[PDB]
Design a protein around this ligand. Structure first.
Ligand code: 43U
Ligand code: BR
Length: 113
């Protein structure tokens, strides 16, 4: 794997630690979540992201972070705010936005000098 793949794997591992029950580990099915495919146009989950890293499909942290954002946004769209899934998505979203912030990335870049 390349350094960018390893960095994204790092971020993904840290984010998945925030989902110990594995609700974001694989695609949400309509059996699990009635009507989901009628509401959510562009599904995403951590497993799909892992596959995209392995398939070398992300060129940048920006592209990875967009998939991560989509995953949380989907959960916060389908599910109401009082639900397990909405609250967990929000928790993960905030963790990821901090982890992959411009300031965090600048700190990493400084150390790569
Ligand atoms: C794969 O998802 C699940 C797995 C097991 C169980 Br029980 C629930 C979900 C799930 N349910 C809903 N309503 N919204 C989600 N957003 C992300 N996960 C989910
Ligand atoms: Br719930």
């Amino acid at each position: 794997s390349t350094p960018i793949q390893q960095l994204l794997e790092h971020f993904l591992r840290q984010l998945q630690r925030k989902d110990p029950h594995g609700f974001f580990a694989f695609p949400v099915t309509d059996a699990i979540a009635p009507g989901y495919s009628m509401i959510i146009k562009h599904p995403m989950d951590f497993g799909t992201m892992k596959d995209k890293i392995v398939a070398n499909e992300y060129k940048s942290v920006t592209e990875f972070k967009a998939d991560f954002k989509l995953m949380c946004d989907n959960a916060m769209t389908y599910n109401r705010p009082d639900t397990v899934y909405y609250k967990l998505a929000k928790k993960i979203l905030h963790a990821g936005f901090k982890m992959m912030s411009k300031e965090r990335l600048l700190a990493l870049k400084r150390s790569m000098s």
